[PDB]
Ligand binder design. Structure first.
Ligand SMILES: COc1cc(-c2cncc(-c3ccc(C4CCN(C)CC4)cc3)c2C)cc(OC)c1OC
Ligand SMILES: COc1cc(-c2cncc(-c3ccc(C4CCN(C)CC4)cc3)c2C)cc(OC)c1OC
Ligand SMILES: COc1cc(-c2cncc(-c3ccc(C4CCN(C)CC4)cc3)c2C)cc(OC)c1OC
Ligand SMILES: COc1cc(-c2cncc(-c3ccc(C4CCN(C)CC4)cc3)c2C)cc(OC)c1OC
Lengths: 292, 284
């Protein structure tokens, strides 16, 4: 049984469209890529060829298709469906307790360490577009990382780095200093891992804002909401992150709560301008495993 | 809307190291389904990457329908779906069938037409230049209208090794200029000249025809080694035999000349696919 029914559109953007569909009686997600993003479709397909990519905290792959008649091409990705939506959606109108906040951020750290660490198989993988819209929320209170169209792969045993062919760049709001100032070392796998760590720290901040302590919580805001225009340009982000050396502010109410005090320390160790000073994904996972 | 993806696999029409090809049915319509071996996964990726870059559409190119990747419990399944040609490969067809002047010319001009379409860069939104890198009579299909189409872009390059029996001298002696796209066109032209020879042998003249044989059948073993081929093609500089009977027939006399000008040791002396088309249009 291969047939799918497209039932409702759950997202439309420059990327294309995502539909809730039905397959063998179950919900699936069907992404139809824009022509503009054909190189993301092919990269995501290369990544999902890897059987040992499968993980609790990585969006589950069902199929990939490229179809054509005459001069028209359609590009399809079929995945598991998460009806709670993205972490971005979820944080807009839910607050968290300690247990839920740590479960979410540990699950994302678990997914990211699974990507970064080679299995001897699954190459080491850097994502390059980590953000709260690219994380889905699951009914077990864990999350899974989505969108491997920009990913970079590295194999330690063979000294092979595969940066793919995709002129797409990461989401501007989440770009590390070395991406915004274009000094990143493009032939260095560790450089791409460190870009993911920066973005992870931003997602940690977005989540922690929504965790209640002492009867107080912050409203959902995206990273740098206070310092850049709506719909910030590459140069807008370069100004605040590289010129102004801005980092997200830590609300002072966090310092009364031991959990949020520990999280503030962790996100600050994701945000050093020196990429080599940043924590590893494995260290973040070990730190979050110890925090309560 | 309903997205009907079910394909009924009806009969296996090919099995090899590459995997399998099946005649299949989608929505009442025959399709061909290549199911890739794990050995040959990179051929699926390369053909899929090429079609994601340029949707080739030509009478003499096998028609693309789909690339499908399906997650299994323990493996990834890779299918390429194309038009189905019930007459099968030119290799298959030549075993039994003999040709007359009109059919022989229609076959070889259709292959040259496909090959020139691959080779040529077209500007606009056009196509990059493409070299095939594994041209042979098993990678050409026969159509009911008497024309052929070129198949298998798993080794194609845009601007696994080729089949050893069809390798040009510069591939066998490792002198090929690998940073020069024209080098890869010239390797295809060599292979084209061998396919021309295979087809010409099956053209009847004055009641005479040669039996089907693959190129170099009289000088190398079955599944020749790289070294077997190097010694024939590079060291001794042998070329396929032209029978005397061809020189009584004006079509086969012209085709002998053409195939000679695809087999020069010096790759830059070989005819271009566009020049081969022009020559073929002036025969008969
Ligand atoms: C993959 O292959 C086959 C596909 C199909 C097929 C099935 N549904 C819909 C379509 C379709 C409709 C509309 C557009 C365009 C039209 C103009 N503009 C507005 C953009 C949209 C594109 C595509 C097709 C082509 C049929 C086939 O054979 C009958 C195929 O061949 C096996
Ligand atoms: C990020 O990337 C991909 C994501 C998905 C995906 C998978 N499950 C569920 C969803 C989803 C469903 C519903 C809502 C919302 C809709 C409106 N409101 C806010 C309530 C609920 C949001 C999101 C998505 C978008 C699939 C993908 O590919 C098939 C993705 O690309 C890799
Ligand atoms: C995913 O996988 C396979 C799909 C198909 C297939 C089946 N029905 C319809 C389609 C279709 C084509 C094109 C559009 C257009 C129409 C609207 N326009 C504005 C944009 C989109 C819609 C639908 C397809 C592509 C066949 C397959 O096998 C032969 C598939 O598996 C390889
Ligand atoms: C070289 O490469 C590819 C070829 C094909 C392909 C396309 N049409 C028809 C065929 C075929 C059908 C039927 C017979 C036989 C059946 C028994 N008897 C009656 C003699 C003839 C042979 C061959 C094939 C093999 C598809 C491919 O991919 C999907 C190929 O790979 C790119």
């Amino acid at each position: 049984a291969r047939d799918i029914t497209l039932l409702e559109c759950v997202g439309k953007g420059r990327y294309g469209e995502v539909w809730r569909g039905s397959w063998q009686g179950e919900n699936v997600a069907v992404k139809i890529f824009s022509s503009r993003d054909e190189k993301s479709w092919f990269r995501e397909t290369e990544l999902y060829n890897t059987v040992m990519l499968r993980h609790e905290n990585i969006l589950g792959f069902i199929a990939s298709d490229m179809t054509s008649r005459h001069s028209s091409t359609q590009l399809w990705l079929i995945t598991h469906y998460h009806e709670m939506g993205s972490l971005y959606d979820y944080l807009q109108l839910t607050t968290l307790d300690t247990v839920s906040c740590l479960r979410i951020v540990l699950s994302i750290a678990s997914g990211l360490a699974h990507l970064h660490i080679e299995i001897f198989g699954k190459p080491a993988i850097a994502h390059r577009d980590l953000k709260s819209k690219n994380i889905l929320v699951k009914k077990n209170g864990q999350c899974c990382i989505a969108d491997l169209g920009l990913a970079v792969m590295h194999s330690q045993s063979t000294n092979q780095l595969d940066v793919g062919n995709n002129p797409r760049v990461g989401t501007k709001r989440y770009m590390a200093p070395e991406v915004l100032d274009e000094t990143i070392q493009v032939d260095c796998f560790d450089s791409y891992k460190r870009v993911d760590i920066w973005a992870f720290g931003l997602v940690l901040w977005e989540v922690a804002r929504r965790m209640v302590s002492n009867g107080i919580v912050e409203d959902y805001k995206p990273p740098f909401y206070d310092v850049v225009p709506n719909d910030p340009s590459f140069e807008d982000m370069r100004k605040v992150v590289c010129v102004d050396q801005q980092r997200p502010n830590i609300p002072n109410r966090w310092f009364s709560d031991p959990t949020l005090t520990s999280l503030a320390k962790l996100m600050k160790e994701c945000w050093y301008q020196n990429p080599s000073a940043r924590l590893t994904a494995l260290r973040i996972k070990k730190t979050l495993t110890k925090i309560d």
